[PDB]
């Protein structure tokens, strides 16, 4: 009776008011109504047409009003999505995540999964990387088997863990279809990085697609992840990563702004075209056979190798609480050429296989 | 990709999300043409239909939030696009219309149809009222009245009623999505600008809000060029000339002008809107035919609804003759009812429709 079209509509009407009368907690409650209604839309009935119309109306109004670009709304939106998530409970040390929002309209290499693996081979670092859809999937490893119930069994012995977002965030599965149909960006576009199922992570790199969004996204990350020291990163070319060409702005949350350039890591610049994504199987083959194998070195100017080294250098400096980027390079180089990075990944894959 | 595609619609929605918005009045026109093609060619229960309903919902919601749809040039272009799916009437070649936008939250008597019928009894006046039932309950199938039959009824009838659904097939297509949205959109204010007969040269257009009236005055001049028009707003919150308190009129007089009306100027007491309520289409029609039009009430009985009809007729008549002698309008509205002319003019229209 309460989780209805009529309730959703009363929220939509608050958004159309001048000025708007929708609080951040109102947004939280609205999204629970929406996720409730979208489970009911199993066929293309007229009921489904009505619900899809009302849901599209709500999210569209939220976007025009720009309240979804606001710290407290992003936080509340994330909170509501996570109510339909499998979360990991661990018994209560530097544990890091690296992920971006996407939505930069770019097709760059999976540098976050690769740098997470390289960072995980540096003594003292533990990496639990949470990402959307596959790369590790294609390396002989059924990511289906990594869920709420199995993450705790794997936690103790693994320097590196990978968590595939869709096996945790069922809520995101319900809005999947209306998001594709909408074509426009909505609050769901920036939630990915704030849906980490394991609360033990106390440091992260979160890429956003836009400079405009970064300051409020910084404040949302501090609301969703109160303990964590966080780098928010935007590549000036329009990139939710530390960019292999031109500059990257960093918003530093330390419970602050600076700039990164490849020259600061003793690296050449590489255009996005040189750092392209080939899809998860080819990306996996490149990472396994070109990078973790020790084929390339610092000084070879191999773009995707350079790109991984740089994002690992940043994970390292964040973990140690300094800005010695060339020390980070050295430590990333060591993690590759010692075989430590490849061992860390192989341990994780054996862990998952024998579950 | 074809121009009449989800991809084209999506591109227009994105212009509304921009800071500031980059959707022009002509873009809204194109956008509406795209919406009407998509909904026209909707495959029932298809994934397409769900996606089309999602994109259309998104556009119309985006548009209402920007408030762009309450601007003269946007309102006019939106009316223009809707009319490309309308059956317009072709007439060989003073004709008036009276209608309001609706959305004032009031449920008073159908003064629009009543005053249009009383006006049609006045020698020298022809009334072609366009509206979105009351006349359907008096024994006449309004579905018989369309673009191909209006011409047959045009020459022998002082009064005509046009039910909008039998003309605007474009409005028909957005009908279901308007109910699903449950919020006001551009479509909530276009009805009065969709008159299918170009021969109408004068009209009273009611609007629900003081804020909308100045932009709606401009929109009406773009949609009906060279039409003497009264935009009217009753201060109580009414898309008619109010039976209580003051009504503001914006005068589109092809020759900016505004003036205030109140009942005292007609020789009439005020009446609360509770004293002037709708009893639904059946009883409204019986009140109109058997009491009002049969001459059971006179000027000076202070019958609220009878007074309500006289006043709106007085305005129609003063508009028609190019003066503001309102009491003269009341004398003429009175002569129309008590002569049996108003009732004859209606009864003629009913019988015309019957023999189609
Ligand atoms: N579609 C998703 C599903 C998840 F589980 C997590 C993130 C997304 C996303 O849209 O980024």
XYZ file of C-alpha atoms and ligand atoms in Angstrom:
722
model
C 0.000 0.000 0.000
C 2.840 2.512 0.921
C 5.431 1.288 -1.657
C 3.181 2.447 -4.579
C 3.095 4.609 -7.774
C 1.131 7.256 -5.757
C 3.925 7.505 -3.097
C 6.623 7.727 -5.826
C 4.511 10.493 -7.559
C 4.284 12.519 -4.266
C 8.166 12.486 -4.228
C 8.337 13.512 -7.940
C 5.994 16.484 -7.097
C 8.441 17.678 -4.349
C 11.125 17.887 -7.123
C 8.843 20.050 -9.394
C 8.122 22.526 -6.524
C 9.965 25.936 -6.719
C 12.126 25.655 -4.820
C 12.351 21.814 -4.568
C 11.015 20.150 -1.343
C 12.878 16.767 -1.660
C 15.392 16.137 1.178
C 18.339 13.692 0.830
C 16.431 11.287 3.191
C 13.355 11.790 0.901
C 15.640 10.642 -1.979
C 16.670 7.577 0.096
C 12.944 6.659 0.692
C 11.925 7.366 -2.980
C 14.638 4.941 -4.206
C 13.294 2.170 -1.904
C 9.822 2.798 -3.447
C 11.415 2.656 -6.980
C 13.489 -0.550 -6.341
C 10.275 -2.111 -4.836
C 8.201 -1.176 -7.985
C 10.859 -2.272 -10.573
C 10.871 -5.897 -9.201
C 7.076 -6.004 -10.030
C 7.726 -5.143 -13.764
C 8.410 -8.744 -14.991
C 6.328 -8.261 -18.236
C 5.629 -5.278 -20.617
C 2.077 -4.876 -19.133
C 0.335 -1.447 -18.936
C 1.253 -1.562 -15.163
C 4.935 -1.791 -16.267
C 4.405 1.197 -18.675
C 2.970 3.283 -15.717
C 5.806 2.347 -13.290
C 8.539 2.929 -15.934
C 6.909 6.343 -16.767
C 6.785 7.402 -13.046
C 10.357 6.117 -12.355
C 11.768 7.862 -15.499
C 9.946 11.082 -14.416
C 11.489 10.943 -10.892
C 15.143 10.340 -11.981
C 14.865 12.895 -14.842
C 13.506 15.605 -12.474
C 16.287 14.694 -9.969
C 18.921 15.303 -12.783
C 17.481 18.684 -14.067
C 17.251 19.905 -10.405
C 20.984 18.788 -10.005
C 20.302 17.548 -6.381
C 21.961 14.183 -7.486
C 25.245 16.221 -7.899
C 24.988 17.020 -4.101
C 27.124 15.191 -1.459
C 24.241 14.235 0.908
C 21.923 13.012 -1.924
C 24.692 10.842 -3.451
C 25.356 9.382 0.081
C 21.592 8.702 0.627
C 21.189 7.217 -2.921
C 24.126 4.815 -2.123
C 22.590 3.968 1.317
C 19.228 3.006 -0.386
C 20.922 0.837 -3.105
C 22.984 -0.976 -0.379
C 19.736 -2.011 1.444
C 19.254 -4.524 -1.474
C 22.957 -5.605 -1.373
C 24.651 -8.717 0.051
C 27.199 -7.035 2.457
C 30.332 -8.792 3.861
C 30.532 -9.254 7.693
C 34.202 -9.718 8.892
C 35.556 -10.195 12.485
C 37.060 -6.854 13.788
C 46.660 -2.439 8.530
C 46.366 -0.782 5.012
C 43.547 -2.231 2.810
C 42.894 -0.370 -0.462
C 40.342 -0.190 -3.281
C 40.709 1.572 -6.683
C 37.659 2.197 -8.975
C 36.075 5.052 -11.023
C 32.473 6.173 -11.782
C 32.873 5.554 -15.554
C 30.772 7.881 -17.781
C 33.791 9.804 -19.258
C 32.913 8.347 -22.720
C 36.430 6.782 -22.896
C 37.588 3.237 -23.784
C 40.871 2.922 -21.784
C 42.561 -0.269 -20.443
C 41.332 -1.866 -17.154
C 44.142 -0.099 -15.188
C 42.286 -0.288 -11.800
C 42.150 -4.147 -11.669
C 45.787 -4.304 -12.988
C 47.255 -1.657 -10.594
C 45.253 -3.294 -7.724
C 47.015 -6.610 -8.567
C 50.458 -4.890 -8.863
C 49.918 -2.953 -5.537
C 48.883 -6.264 -3.806
C 52.459 -7.658 -4.264
C 54.097 -4.735 -2.345
C 54.777 -6.006 1.260
C 52.349 -4.332 3.735
C 49.512 -3.723 1.187
C 46.186 -5.580 1.040
C 43.902 -4.890 -1.963
C 40.170 -5.664 -2.077
C 39.178 -4.237 -5.514
C 35.419 -3.860 -6.191
C 34.428 -3.368 -9.864
C 31.558 -3.719 -12.400
C 31.427 -6.175 -15.402
C 35.200 -10.413 -16.125
C 38.990 -9.746 -16.791
C 39.955 -12.186 -13.934
C 36.869 -14.213 -15.054
C 38.750 -15.061 -18.310
C 41.954 -16.159 -16.390
C 40.314 -19.483 -15.254
C 38.447 -18.125 -12.182
C 34.613 -18.354 -11.599
C 33.776 -14.935 -9.995
C 30.248 -16.399 -9.298
C 31.985 -18.212 -6.346
C 33.091 -14.833 -4.723
C 30.018 -13.614 -2.695
C 28.978 -12.312 0.807
C 29.398 -15.861 2.264
C 32.825 -16.743 0.642
C 34.720 -13.336 0.960
C 35.311 -14.009 4.731
C 36.900 -17.496 4.001
C 39.254 -15.834 1.404
C 40.055 -12.651 3.484
C 42.905 -13.921 5.759
C 45.323 -15.611 3.263
C 44.916 -13.319 0.129
C 47.025 -10.113 -0.380
C 44.635 -9.480 -3.369
C 40.835 -9.955 -3.675
C 38.455 -9.085 -6.554
C 34.691 -8.505 -5.944
C 32.390 -8.369 -9.041
C 29.741 -5.683 -8.216
C 26.703 -7.490 -9.800
C 27.069 -10.533 -7.393
C 26.500 -8.092 -4.443
C 24.284 -5.146 -5.614
C 20.910 -6.741 -6.586
C 19.342 -3.226 -6.386
C 21.513 -2.107 -9.340
C 20.226 -5.190 -11.275
C 16.601 -3.907 -10.876
C 17.360 -0.369 -12.349
C 19.642 -1.912 -15.066
C 16.969 -1.915 -17.823
C 15.383 1.526 -17.165
C 18.922 3.046 -17.068
C 19.636 1.656 -20.633
C 16.156 2.850 -21.884
C 16.687 6.338 -20.276
C 19.950 6.957 -22.242
C 20.618 10.039 -19.958
C 22.866 10.021 -16.850
C 21.176 9.696 -13.411
C 22.340 9.392 -9.759
C 22.960 5.596 -10.404
C 25.901 6.572 -12.728
C 28.159 7.663 -9.768
C 27.107 5.031 -7.127
C 29.442 2.176 -8.314
C 32.462 3.375 -6.252
C 30.428 3.867 -2.997
C 28.941 0.296 -2.993
C 32.080 -1.481 -1.629
C 30.611 -4.508 0.309
C 33.610 -4.827 2.763
C 33.825 -1.973 5.380
C 37.459 -2.926 6.381
C 38.828 -0.952 3.365
C 40.317 2.251 4.942
C 41.972 3.810 1.811
C 40.825 4.102 -1.833
C 41.278 5.862 -5.212
C 37.886 6.954 -6.699
C 37.880 8.383 -10.240
C 35.038 10.725 -11.311
C 34.286 11.656 -14.978
C 33.950 15.448 -14.357
C 35.862 18.246 -12.546
C 32.455 19.916 -11.702
C 31.277 16.789 -9.723
C 34.614 16.083 -7.869
C 34.318 18.397 -4.787
C 30.778 17.134 -3.834
C 31.798 13.525 -4.748
C 34.743 13.970 -2.298
C 32.206 14.952 0.474
C 29.913 11.972 -0.458
C 32.896 9.518 -0.196
C 33.672 11.039 3.297
C 29.927 10.483 4.218
C 29.738 6.893 2.740
C 33.317 5.967 3.922
C 33.931 8.023 7.120
C 37.160 6.226 8.243
C 38.856 6.098 4.773
C 41.708 8.282 3.455
C 40.606 8.895 -0.185
C 42.081 10.292 -3.457
C 39.354 11.479 -5.854
C 41.029 11.735 -9.326
C 39.983 13.389 -12.645
C 42.184 13.311 -15.797
C 41.888 16.752 -17.547
C 41.331 14.910 -20.907
C 38.024 13.629 -19.376
C 39.083 10.424 -17.616
C 38.033 8.754 -14.296
C 41.691 7.594 -13.796
C 45.212 8.989 -13.294
C 45.710 9.844 -17.024
C 48.725 8.683 -19.115
C 48.550 12.065 -21.022
C 48.243 15.631 -19.583
C 47.328 16.391 -15.943
C 45.212 14.679 -13.232
C 43.696 16.751 -10.382
C 43.483 14.937 -7.004
C 41.043 15.878 -4.183
C 42.646 14.394 -1.000
C 40.336 13.500 1.970
C 42.549 12.997 5.096
C 40.532 12.484 8.341
C 43.192 19.423 -0.108
C 44.044 19.505 -3.887
C 47.212 18.763 -5.969
C 48.084 17.684 -9.559
C 49.750 14.606 -11.151
C 51.756 14.491 -14.436
C 53.523 11.396 -15.878
C 56.901 13.329 -15.762
C 56.478 13.299 -11.900
C 56.779 9.428 -12.038
C 59.744 9.586 -14.492
C 57.387 8.335 -17.284
C 56.691 9.435 -20.895
C 53.152 10.632 -21.833
C 50.926 8.231 -23.886
C 47.707 9.188 -25.772
C 44.444 7.359 -24.844
C 44.602 5.566 -28.268
C 47.858 3.835 -27.058
C 46.117 2.748 -23.758
C 42.838 1.383 -25.282
C 40.631 -1.416 -23.817
C 40.549 -4.591 -26.008
C 37.767 -6.181 -23.837
C 38.258 -8.497 -20.801
C 39.860 -11.589 -22.483
C 42.500 -9.602 -24.475
C 43.019 -7.166 -21.506
C 43.528 -10.289 -19.302
C 46.005 -11.857 -21.798
C 47.959 -8.482 -21.996
C 48.076 -8.151 -18.148
C 49.090 -11.824 -17.576
C 51.459 -12.277 -20.602
C 52.988 -8.725 -21.123
C 52.931 -7.025 -17.625
C 52.947 -9.616 -14.733
C 55.387 -11.895 -16.714
C 58.169 -9.222 -16.471
C 58.288 -8.802 -20.322
C 58.356 -4.936 -20.023
C 60.375 -2.661 -17.659
C 60.379 1.008 -16.602
C 62.317 2.737 -19.465
C 60.676 0.600 -22.280
C 57.912 3.321 -22.712
C 55.287 0.566 -23.289
C 52.066 2.589 -22.803
C 49.811 0.107 -20.911
C 52.783 -1.022 -18.715
C 53.668 2.671 -17.955
C 49.906 3.303 -17.282
C 49.668 0.409 -14.732
C 53.026 1.371 -13.019
C 51.742 4.978 -12.549
C 48.352 4.035 -10.986
C 50.242 1.531 -8.721
C 52.778 4.260 -7.699
C 49.739 6.387 -6.605
C 48.114 3.439 -4.679
C 51.537 3.010 -2.928
C 52.053 6.743 -1.973
C 48.410 6.946 -0.660
C 49.062 3.735 1.449
C 52.293 5.176 2.989
C 50.908 8.766 3.441
C 53.444 10.695 1.223
C 53.932 12.041 -2.372
C 57.213 10.242 -3.317
C 55.834 9.118 -6.737
C 59.256 7.788 -7.973
C 59.529 5.630 -4.784
C 56.012 4.342 -5.800
C 57.311 3.499 -9.315
C 60.333 1.602 -7.748
C 57.950 -0.415 -5.451
C 55.542 -1.205 -8.383
C 58.565 -2.265 -10.517
C 59.725 -4.487 -7.584
C 56.204 -6.047 -7.216
C 56.261 -6.993 -10.993
C 59.920 -8.096 -11.508
C 60.164 -10.087 -8.164
C 57.160 -12.213 -9.383
C 55.297 -10.983 -6.211
C 52.385 -9.373 -8.182
C 51.772 -12.566 -10.271
C 51.996 -14.812 -7.128
C 49.426 -12.564 -5.276
C 46.972 -12.982 -8.192
C 47.695 -16.768 -8.572
C 47.092 -17.289 -4.786
C 43.683 -15.487 -5.126
C 42.695 -17.603 -8.245
C 43.632 -20.940 -6.491
C 41.695 -19.668 -3.366
C 38.559 -19.156 -5.569
C 39.002 -22.404 -7.628
C 39.226 -24.593 -4.424
C 36.097 -23.055 -2.704
C 19.424 6.419 -37.475
C 16.073 7.855 -38.752
C 15.068 11.350 -37.508
C 11.797 9.840 -36.095
C 13.742 7.701 -33.531
C 14.464 7.262 -29.767
C 18.042 8.509 -30.524
C 16.661 11.852 -31.858
C 14.347 12.228 -28.834
C 17.273 11.370 -26.460
C 19.388 14.157 -28.118
C 16.602 16.737 -27.332
C 16.223 15.628 -23.647
C 20.052 16.103 -23.225
C 19.671 19.791 -24.392
C 17.187 20.252 -21.474
C 19.766 18.785 -18.971
C 22.407 21.372 -20.136
C 23.368 24.449 -17.977
C 21.714 26.485 -19.210
C 19.204 24.436 -21.276
C 19.929 24.481 -25.102
C 16.385 23.461 -26.277
C 14.907 26.148 -28.590
C 11.168 26.702 -29.254
C 11.617 25.011 -32.714
C 13.516 22.101 -31.036
C 10.419 21.464 -28.839
C 8.378 21.440 -32.099
C 10.683 18.796 -33.688
C 10.819 16.894 -30.348
C 7.018 16.724 -30.156
C 6.771 15.492 -33.785
C 9.296 12.722 -32.786
C 7.259 11.793 -29.643
C 3.965 11.560 -31.658
C 5.536 9.294 -34.405
C 7.048 6.961 -31.701
C 3.784 6.623 -29.675
C 1.756 6.313 -32.973
C 3.912 3.291 -34.108
C 4.166 1.715 -30.544
C 4.025 -2.121 -30.683
C 1.754 -3.192 -27.744
C 3.718 -5.030 -24.956
C 7.051 -4.623 -26.915
C 10.325 -3.662 -25.131
C 10.292 -0.689 -27.628
C 7.022 0.612 -26.074
C 8.547 0.496 -22.504
C 11.708 2.324 -23.767
C 9.635 4.872 -25.757
C 7.428 5.529 -22.659
C 10.698 5.987 -20.628
C 12.229 8.533 -23.094
C 8.883 10.454 -23.544
C 8.340 10.587 -19.734
C 11.950 11.885 -19.392
C 11.553 14.656 -22.015
C 8.164 15.940 -20.737
C 9.337 15.872 -17.074
C 12.632 17.618 -18.020
C 10.628 20.224 -19.944
C 8.236 21.008 -17.011
C 11.207 21.302 -14.564
C 12.969 23.843 -16.895
C 9.577 25.688 -17.072
C 10.421 26.332 -20.782
C 6.880 24.942 -21.638
C 5.282 28.090 -19.995
C 7.009 30.455 -22.496
C 4.956 32.024 -25.371
C 7.197 30.792 -28.232
C 7.454 27.252 -26.708
C 3.642 27.041 -26.073
C 2.934 28.173 -29.703
C 5.474 25.705 -31.282
C 4.083 22.854 -29.092
C 0.526 23.661 -30.299
C 1.895 23.810 -33.898
C 3.448 20.257 -33.598
C 0.274 18.743 -31.998
C -1.817 20.209 -34.892
C 0.286 18.282 -37.523
C -1.615 15.141 -36.186
C -5.010 17.004 -36.199
C -7.891 16.938 -38.744
C -8.359 20.672 -39.533
C -11.768 21.764 -41.018
C -11.869 23.193 -44.590
C -14.659 25.816 -45.039
C -15.580 27.335 -48.457
C -15.165 31.008 -47.205
C -18.636 37.197 -36.210
C -17.503 33.647 -35.160
C -16.475 33.195 -31.490
C -15.126 30.356 -29.240
C -14.993 30.263 -25.380
C -12.780 27.770 -23.478
C -10.272 27.578 -20.563
C -6.951 25.693 -20.069
C -8.312 23.876 -16.974
C -6.034 23.018 -14.003
C -7.434 25.736 -11.620
C -8.507 22.963 -9.136
C -12.187 24.206 -9.343
C -15.392 22.256 -10.314
C -17.940 25.027 -11.081
C -20.876 24.771 -13.585
C -20.103 24.349 -17.339
C -20.505 28.129 -18.009
C -18.299 27.755 -21.211
C -20.838 25.574 -23.136
C -23.858 27.376 -21.558
C -22.627 30.916 -22.452
C -21.574 29.685 -25.965
C -25.189 28.377 -26.495
C -26.810 31.602 -25.063
C -24.449 33.792 -27.233
C -25.576 31.783 -30.360
C -29.176 33.007 -29.731
C -28.049 36.665 -30.201
C -28.796 37.941 -33.765
C -25.425 38.593 -35.494
C -23.395 35.963 -33.519
C -22.090 32.496 -34.519
C -20.467 30.278 -31.835
C -18.097 27.362 -32.614
C -17.112 26.126 -29.110
C -14.139 23.684 -29.006
C -13.917 21.683 -25.714
C -12.815 18.324 -24.176
C -20.114 15.144 -22.879
C -22.709 17.642 -21.415
C -24.259 17.986 -24.936
C -23.822 14.198 -25.454
C -26.382 13.562 -22.611
C -29.084 15.700 -24.405
C -29.471 13.003 -27.165
C -26.712 13.677 -29.769
C -23.649 11.490 -30.598
C -20.745 14.026 -30.580
C -18.485 11.365 -32.266
C -20.464 12.056 -35.535
C -18.957 15.653 -35.467
C -15.469 15.547 -37.162
C -13.459 17.461 -39.849
C -15.562 15.874 -42.690
C -19.041 16.642 -41.127
C -18.401 20.166 -39.557
C -18.618 21.578 -43.162
C -22.178 20.056 -43.649
C -23.348 21.539 -40.256
C -21.494 24.897 -40.696
C -23.945 26.898 -42.895
C -27.342 26.243 -41.087
C -26.097 26.314 -37.401
C -25.721 29.431 -35.131
C -24.194 27.044 -32.498
C -21.570 24.279 -33.029
C -19.759 22.102 -30.413
C -16.480 20.335 -31.412
C -15.292 17.548 -29.002
C -11.415 17.771 -29.271
C -10.703 13.961 -29.193
C -12.460 13.611 -32.653
C -9.913 16.130 -34.096
C -6.531 15.967 -32.215
C -5.255 12.350 -32.813
C -1.857 13.615 -31.476
C -3.436 14.435 -28.050
C -5.052 10.940 -28.282
C -1.521 9.392 -28.597
C -0.098 11.142 -25.383
C -3.418 10.472 -23.486
C -2.189 7.282 -21.665
C 1.290 8.732 -20.775
C -0.370 11.929 -19.386
C -2.413 9.777 -16.911
C 0.697 7.658 -16.012
C 2.897 10.780 -15.431
C 0.176 12.177 -13.097
C 2.075 15.563 -13.281
C 1.206 18.620 -15.408
C 3.097 18.836 -18.767
C 3.027 21.224 -21.806
C -0.167 19.232 -22.915
C -2.117 20.700 -19.934
C -2.287 24.188 -21.631
C -2.602 23.469 -25.430
C -6.381 22.612 -25.795
C -7.531 26.263 -26.291
C -4.916 26.766 -29.101
C -6.100 23.651 -31.088
C -9.308 25.173 -32.636
C -9.780 23.170 -35.911
C -11.722 26.011 -37.734
C -9.560 28.954 -38.984
C -12.803 31.045 -39.574
C -13.175 31.726 -35.782
C -12.047 35.429 -35.556
C -12.698 36.038 -31.773
C -12.344 33.968 -28.530
C -12.231 34.129 -24.687
C -9.307 31.906 -23.548
C -9.344 31.163 -19.788
C -6.019 30.290 -18.003
C -5.670 28.898 -14.418
C -2.844 31.206 -13.137
C -2.015 34.965 -13.182
C 1.682 34.050 -13.999
C 0.721 32.014 -17.183
C -1.665 34.688 -18.638
C 0.908 37.189 -20.084
C 2.841 34.349 -21.897
C -0.479 32.660 -22.965
C -1.692 36.048 -24.400
C 1.477 36.074 -26.604
C 1.115 32.306 -27.487
C -2.542 32.849 -28.611
C -1.446 35.772 -30.902
C 1.186 33.469 -32.527
C -1.393 30.592 -32.907
C -4.452 32.730 -33.937
C -2.986 35.801 -35.751
C -5.574 38.596 -36.374
C -8.042 37.282 -33.728
C -9.521 39.661 -31.097
C -8.925 37.536 -27.952
C -9.697 37.927 -24.211
C -7.295 35.971 -21.963
C -9.209 35.854 -18.632
C -8.176 34.819 -15.065
C -10.555 34.968 -12.051
C -8.539 36.081 -8.946
C -10.081 33.233 -6.794
C -8.088 30.865 -9.115
C -10.476 30.305 -12.070
C -9.983 29.909 -15.872
C -13.325 31.792 -16.426
C -14.861 35.200 -15.550
C -15.416 34.498 -11.785
C -18.910 34.899 -10.238
C -17.100 36.265 -7.087
C -14.239 38.802 -6.772
C -12.337 40.302 -9.737
C -11.318 38.727 -13.088
C -8.319 40.175 -15.020
C -8.594 40.286 -18.874
C -5.558 40.609 -21.242
C -6.926 42.243 -24.461
C -5.293 41.006 -27.700
C -6.858 43.752 -29.908
C -5.021 43.949 -33.277
C -5.150 47.830 -33.419
C -0.528 44.986 -23.727
C -4.094 46.264 -22.807
C -5.532 44.875 -19.488
C -8.753 45.609 -17.497
C -10.574 44.146 -14.440
C -14.171 42.765 -14.369
C -16.436 42.121 -11.349
C -20.151 41.166 -11.243
C -21.277 44.711 -10.098
C -20.275 45.972 -13.631
C -22.974 43.583 -15.096
C -25.712 44.627 -12.576
C -25.192 41.343 -10.638
C -24.564 40.274 -7.005
C -21.366 38.236 -6.301
C -21.789 34.424 -5.846
C -19.377 32.007 -4.039
C -18.103 29.102 -6.255
C -19.994 26.644 -3.948
C -23.273 28.317 -5.169
C -22.065 27.736 -8.811
C -20.986 24.029 -8.616
C -21.113 21.249 -11.281
C -23.654 18.403 -10.641
C -21.839 16.450 -13.426
C -22.661 16.377 -17.194
C -26.185 14.761 -16.959
C -27.652 17.170 -14.331
C -25.661 20.188 -15.721
C -27.397 19.518 -19.123
C -30.888 19.086 -17.536
C -30.388 22.339 -15.471
C -29.362 24.068 -18.747
C -32.211 22.781 -21.078
C -35.186 22.493 -18.656
C -34.533 25.543 -16.369
C -31.951 28.112 -17.682
C -32.817 27.843 -21.448
C -36.602 27.350 -20.711
C -36.517 30.794 -18.976
C -37.302 29.769 -15.343
C -34.905 32.512 -14.088
C -34.602 36.242 -14.954
C -32.048 39.041 -14.485
C -32.781 40.081 -10.833
C -33.683 36.622 -9.307
C -29.973 36.508 -8.183
C -29.932 32.785 -9.245
C -26.165 32.057 -8.927
C -25.664 29.766 -11.985
C -28.148 31.777 -14.173
C -26.240 35.005 -13.200
C -22.945 33.082 -13.862
C -24.096 32.203 -17.458
C -25.505 35.753 -18.160
C -22.160 37.387 -17.209
C -19.963 35.065 -19.394
C -22.452 35.611 -22.307
C -22.295 39.429 -21.738
C -18.468 39.201 -22.088
C -18.791 37.042 -25.322
C -21.288 39.655 -26.737
C -19.190 42.786 -25.777
C -16.053 41.085 -27.311
C -18.114 40.350 -30.500
C -19.251 44.028 -31.006
C -15.924 45.821 -30.176
C -17.136 47.617 -26.947
C -17.197 47.127 -23.121
C -20.921 48.044 -22.503
C -21.342 44.955 -20.221
C -24.912 45.825 -19.049
C -25.845 45.988 -22.789
C -24.379 42.418 -23.045
C -26.628 41.290 -20.118
C -29.752 42.766 -21.888
C -28.840 40.799 -25.097
C -28.019 37.531 -23.177
C -31.438 37.970 -21.440
C -33.282 38.564 -24.777
C -31.597 35.360 -26.190
C -32.898 33.076 -23.351
C -36.424 34.590 -22.847
C -37.101 34.744 -26.662
C -36.498 30.926 -26.867
C -33.651 31.718 -29.411
C -30.833 30.222 -27.246
C -32.837 26.945 -26.822
C -33.826 26.855 -30.531
C -30.165 27.454 -31.604
C -29.057 24.444 -29.440
C -32.030 22.191 -30.476
C -31.187 22.978 -34.164
C -27.558 21.866 -33.581
C -28.724 18.610 -31.827
C -31.086 17.701 -34.745
C -28.375 18.642 -37.363
C -25.943 16.173 -35.634
C -28.764 13.506 -35.412
C -29.247 13.495 -39.262
C -25.564 12.670 -40.168
N 25.287 -1.756 -13.173
C 26.075 -1.799 -12.038
C 25.962 -2.884 -11.181
C 26.741 -2.919 -10.047
F 26.621 -3.991 -9.218
C 27.628 -1.922 -9.720
C 27.749 -0.834 -10.567
C 26.976 -0.749 -11.725
C 27.137 0.433 -12.611
O 26.250 0.844 -13.338
O 28.329 0.985 -12.561
